[PDB]
Amino acid sequence: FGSGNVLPVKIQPPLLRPLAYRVLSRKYGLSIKSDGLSALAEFVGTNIGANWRQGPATIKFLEQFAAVWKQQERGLFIDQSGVKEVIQEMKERRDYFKVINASQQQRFSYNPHKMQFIFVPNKKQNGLGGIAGFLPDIEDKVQMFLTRYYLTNDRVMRNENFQMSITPIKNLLGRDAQNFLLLGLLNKNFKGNWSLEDPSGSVEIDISQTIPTQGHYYVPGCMVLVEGIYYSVGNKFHVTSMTLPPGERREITLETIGNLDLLGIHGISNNNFIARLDKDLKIRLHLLEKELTDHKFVILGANLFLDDLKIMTALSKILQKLNDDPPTLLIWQGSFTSVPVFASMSSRNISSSTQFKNNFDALATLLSRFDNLTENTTMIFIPGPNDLWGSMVSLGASGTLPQDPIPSAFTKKINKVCKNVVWSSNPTRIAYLSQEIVIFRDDLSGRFKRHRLEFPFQKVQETRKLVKTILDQGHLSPFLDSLRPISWDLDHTLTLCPIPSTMVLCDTTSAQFDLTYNGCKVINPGSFIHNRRARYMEYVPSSKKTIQEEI
Amino acid sequence: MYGDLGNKLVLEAKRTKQLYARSNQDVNLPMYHEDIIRNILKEVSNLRKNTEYLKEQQQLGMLDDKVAKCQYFVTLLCMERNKRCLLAYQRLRTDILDSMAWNNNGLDLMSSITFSQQDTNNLSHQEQEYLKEYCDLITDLKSGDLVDIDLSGSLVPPSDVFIDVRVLKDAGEIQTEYGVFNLIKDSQFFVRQSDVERLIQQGYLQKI
Amino acid sequence: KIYPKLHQMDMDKVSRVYADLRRESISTGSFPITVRHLESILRIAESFAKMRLSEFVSSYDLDRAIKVVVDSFVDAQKVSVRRQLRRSFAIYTLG
Amino acid sequence: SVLAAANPIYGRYDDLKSPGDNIDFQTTILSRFDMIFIVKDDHNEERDISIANHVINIHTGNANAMQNQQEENGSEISIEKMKRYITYCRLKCAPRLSPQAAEKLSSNFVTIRKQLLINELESTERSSIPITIRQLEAIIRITESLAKLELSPIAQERHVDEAIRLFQASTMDAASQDPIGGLNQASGTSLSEIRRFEQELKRRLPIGWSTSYQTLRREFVDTHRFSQLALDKALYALEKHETIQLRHQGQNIYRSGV
Amino acid sequence: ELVKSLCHVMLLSKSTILEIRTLRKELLKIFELREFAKVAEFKDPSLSLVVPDFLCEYCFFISDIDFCKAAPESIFSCVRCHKAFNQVLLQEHLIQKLRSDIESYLIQDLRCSRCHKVKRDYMSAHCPCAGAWEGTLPRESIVQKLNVFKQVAKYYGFDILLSCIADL
Amino acid sequence: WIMNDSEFPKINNSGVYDNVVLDVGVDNLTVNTILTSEFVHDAFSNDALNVLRGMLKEWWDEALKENSTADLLVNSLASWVQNPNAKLFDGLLRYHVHNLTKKALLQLVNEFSALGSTIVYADRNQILIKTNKYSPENCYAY
């Protein structure tokens, strides 16, 4: 705040504290600590020449120091940071974008009694966790599906059409007739019979004369709306109709939840208070469309193999063109190995972990050539089924959904050759200004096709069916714990109660598509190489996309 | 009949008033009643539908006017009663919020450090917004023509120049006009009353 | 006149004896043992302390009480298992 | 209010014999008790050591030197304070049920009254511990008593769940003694069919590997050997700690030992 | 510790129990300790971490290696033939053991605290019995297992397993 | 579950023994187990098992008649069984082999229990036996 005076005379704070006290402690603010007072002596002594008898200068300085403490939350006591806020003041006279992993995402529970979300303190911050702090507690296993049921039932009960209403199952124990609307998990009992389950209880289900609503998938492990008649001669709910819970747009969903900063980039929330913000959204929507079409981030075709030579040559040819106009973000996705890497008892050949390391060293050679792409592009690394830690147990199969990033030990100098590189979990959330994008990599179509209810009674239609099921169920894993185990405390990562604005859903078993639904956009990159053709697609935050091919 | 539910809401208000009346220290508002309020909203919507239906059924000319007037009046009166109950509940809750906002020396309340009297989730979102603008109004009052007088100061008359105080919570050295106070816990001070009013109000000192 | 106390004593020996007596009853025995028999050892220890006109119970009295209780249980068994039970319970009464 | 204590015939419960041969109280008197607790000893070593230490601390004087502290801090209150709290609560509050509480209670009554029918039909003899309308009114009273503690003017599902759990722990546990074997007319053919099925299962399935309840039902019942009472036969084989284990949400039946 | 470990060796006789137990009490009389004191009981000083079925390529031998009790010159060498092993293979096997243990904890079954039985519901609060749902594999066991791996990775130099511990 | 069960049972009877103790080493356990021998959902196919049995029998017979390659195949079969990198590898086969070896070891211990002796230890490569006699010089014939 100005310079060029004679020299910084040194004076003791005793002759400075009365003015600061009257301006701060009396009127607005308080707690000028002794160390903070000594800190506030240097900057006022920088322009000390001909002052303490002057006019506005000191008062305006104290006013400006108060401006930070009204703006930032800070606290009460003034400490050695007092110079740190004046650095911000002189600062005053893209950004705000992040990539959130599964582990670093904030946790929020839901109270059905209160219709509201309650914060959960993270165990990493306060718990010691020096030896075992990531491990969940058994109580989460008991509430894992109860949390899903509560979220879906709230949405079903707030729909416009419903006001027959959904009845708890145990309310059917004495009735011999009438109709009921039951909502619950569809599964198989320990006896092998199809059944429906809600927190109240369970009931067996008869499909012998069921007429389902075509247009979506009926896989065990998902919420289903059902209608029929209950017979007390046995215990059977004879079904006459079957559907899935309706979906809800995020604009109508946000108002119910207020303005909670779930993926909070505005700020953070703790056990004391939560954060909301509305006025900034308009101006940042303005900035999103303020002639920023130059931003360009690219998702490559999934499942690219580094060990193969033709794939590496095709990637070099693709980066040749990417060098010309550097993408804003470049997301390398899919399994980076063509074979699962396991303990490899045979040591006659070179170890598979060392081979994994070596295959990540050729990337440095191929990438160091293109200096501009290093200089002004950020790369996002998505894991796959055959990466290091998972394949040590699953041996190439698909297991736990929250998949940890690639270890930093076997990939070390790719952080040097490239400028911005971030490793991310299998499900991740890119927060770009007023936009949330979800990155997910698995084969969904095969598992849907294999597991269907099969009621006793052009290929792009399957894509619409998959999109509708995934979006209406509001969850990325419409499956029981048997088909796919889930980390108990990380399940909130996989629940889409607010529908994401943009979705990255790659499946090698499903053809590429571009669909729109209730307030979102779903794109499907897949099969990096196909029919001797290497494909990769571009997407722009202004909701336009392009497909670029290089044999 | 139609308004019989709203009476329950009013009853709840009465209970809150008692907690406001029998309050040696500041208290917290109970949970909001969005479910009951939504029930009155649903029934007044049904009353609006009934009034519409009466409008068409009269304007096709199947019913006598004297007959239709009675149900018209009944629906209007029920809606008026429901409005009265809701407004009374809202005004009582608003008055308590205003009292708390004044009794924290202005400030932004929940965003900044609060005296922990109230939990965040008790208040409704509109109430949370209202509290914010009311606090801003207090703030730009305190910077008006009455700068010298602290409009959020103590409201008990001054009658003791020198008082004995005891520290409740530990802290560091704090500068005051022409001196320093060292807040070592379990220590006693004999000092002028004006210097320690702020610290007593914020819970760092005891006695007077 | 006398009212002895139990300030310093070996809790572990008494706990082990009680647990062993409880175990060796349901397995092979028809003498009911409950928490009510744990307190009898302490009562007999206090009685032996009274015999000496002492105001504090020592280790000898507690050991003697344990021996009395163990001998009262072993000798009410069948002739088949008595020899095994006596050997199994003999470690506690070393003195 | 009545608080009663008694011993069974023969002194101990004698779990080997029938419940009707153990309780000498008629159905007329047993229907006027809201909660009935049957108390048994399990003879576990860990519990025996814990109880022994707790009792020795009482005798050696270490009891009081602890208790006062907790009574001081936040965890216990004196007899007079609790007496005054009881009288204040009884003279001030009298809670009422909510519409959802009645719905949750009716279904529980229907369930606990249905179960008795299956038990009586299986054991072909009447139950010694009866379930009646008084047992519904008892759960209502327990719910309101739980609400009374907090001076709440309304009883809700939170109290209903705890009242139901207390009733299950007290009276349904006593009713459901689940005799392993009584050698009575009930399951008379089972006296040999149990051994028959055990041999057929242990010859089919070696000490390793597993099967399913679906298959063990379909294939072993196609030969018309079903008895409708094989649900507890698997659990009885499990009780041997070697024949049967149940895993994977009860779907998987694993042979674990001889 | 010397006197306790010396008496424990004598105690394994099953035929001279009384004679050894008298001497133990007499020796414990030198110290101010009683014969049944908890501080005077013997416990095994060492834990165990057994990796099963390791192959010797030049020997065709199946051996189970325990990384805690076994002395050196045996961890890194085959028994039948004194041929050295390859260390990174050992580290990879240890990592496999750790990840498999974590998976096994994550896919366990629930039980009633009183009715030792399996939970057969996806959404329930407790047993039909008034009880609670507890785990078949308690957390303390897996915590101790993660504890021992850290010490094993630090006594011998295993960089890969040390990195694997810190990425959790 | 079947790919996470690689632990073998053991016997560790402890004490001080004043009789003679024998330290025998049992080799060829797995090949002996293989050569000797609907409802079940966790078992390997019996036909392929019999094919493998016949293969091992013929290999052993030719190995007896001074064949180096047959001896190498017989020695390397056990290594082949447990290796996933080897093709045609099935986890059910490994579980089947381990489960039959587990039964075979217990049967061998029971067979030793037929004569006066007591097992002390068992580790698939070392077995310790307690004899009735008191002097080592008198156990040559037994």
Ligand SMILES: [Zn+2]
């Ligand atoms: Zn070797």
Ligand SMILES: [Zn+2]
């Ligand atoms: Zn239970």
